[PDB]
Design a binder for this molecule. Structure first.
Ligand code: GDP
Ligand code: GDP
Ligand code: TMA
Ligand code: CL
Ligand code: CL
Ligand code: CL
Ligand code: CL
Lengths: 175, 178
């Protein structure tokens, strides 16, 4: 049977930590990252994941911290290893700028549900990585100009990244 | 900023097979791209069906997986790391195009996404040192697992696929079909 272990974050309610089972053999492995039946149920108000994205990045890249008012995400690493970070970026939240970090790889296949209004980021600790995330929203995709950005090393968040000198976009330097 | 786009083409000989090519934003860090939106891709399925299931297959060099299909499951397949030869086969015994096939080479620079109809066989070969194969499934009701599926031999002479190897790495299921 295709299985998910579904846990909720202790501190950051709305953050789900989902672990799939896998079939492993002489060929490699097969696994399920998502079913609507298991995972859309976790979203509020009948929302559904409706968008799939891939990010292929080199060693020591950070992408983040990115979010917007409406977009839920479901994120994992399907090749290599990342440090996956979620941040509560709701300024009026009692848990504003609290965060959680996960080291995601083939041996620790955590899939993180990131609420709307949370910031999302990852660091490539492998030589290369392929990051997978689904997006749930109504209406039009929120592109970069319509998103907020927090600095990867914002002192108020205090993420313990394995780098002091990541490779960054101009967006992620300007934050 | 860059706009998310798809180029959507239908196969000439195998109607129902779509070849979808995304754009990508490529920079100093690597690339970001969209494999699927419901708005662009679910409308290609018949009768209100929707993709509701996402799967990953991480395979070693020289593996073949296939040829597998079932009577209800539509698939949307690509390779998100490395390189595969992706093959679709019309496996409907009463189809005018029964055992006709199409082969696509999928890699980072040729990011084809193949919509495979229900009743079609699916297969891929890993030409890179390793590959991650991504596919979505659209069906109603319970997932169609191995016992629910049909199986055609990778080297079925009636299909005549041109594979790079005579020595693919196979499961017992895929060997049994020979
Ligand atoms: N946990 C898990 N197991 C799977 C999955 N897909 C297949 N399996 C198991 O792994 C074996 C290999 O599957 P396969 O023969 O390729 O059938 P198919 O994957 O349904 O086409 C099957 O016997 C399944 O029980 C999956 O997504 N998750
Ligand atoms: N073609 C395509 N371009 C994208 C996609 N996502 C983002 N972009 C573009 O790539 C640029 C960088 O993406 P951004 O939103 O900063 O996310 P990041 O790349 O993870 O930092 C933006 O200016 C977008 O216009 C996508 O899915 N497809
Ligand atoms: C292409 N379609 C009309 C079957 C949806
Ligand atoms: Cl993001
Ligand atoms: Cl931390
Ligand atoms: Cl398949
Ligand atoms: Cl061929």
């Amino acid at each position: 049977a295709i299985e998910f272990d579904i846990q909720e974050s202790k501190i950051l309610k709305g953050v789900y930590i989902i672990t799939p089972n896998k079939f492993r053999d002489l060929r490699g492995e097969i696994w399920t990252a998502f079913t609507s039946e298991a995972v859309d149920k976790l979203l509020p108000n009948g929302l559904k994941f409706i968008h799939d994205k891939f990010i292929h990045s080199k060693h020591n890249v950070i992408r983040g911290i990115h979010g917007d008012v409406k977009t839920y995400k479901l994120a994992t690493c399907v090749y290599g290893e990342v440090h996956q970070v979620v941040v509560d970026c709701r300024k009026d939240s009692p848990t504003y700028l609290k965060h959680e970090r996960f080291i995601i790889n083939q041996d620790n296949q955590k899939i993180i549900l990131v609420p709307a209004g949370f910031g999302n980021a990852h660091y490539v600790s492998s030589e290369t990585a392929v990051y997978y995330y689904k997006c749930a929203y109504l209406g039009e995709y929120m592109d970069a100009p319509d998103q907020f950005t927090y600095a990867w090393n914002d002192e108020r968040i205090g993420i313990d990244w394995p780098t002091n000198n990541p490779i960054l976009s101009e967006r992620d330097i300007l934050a």
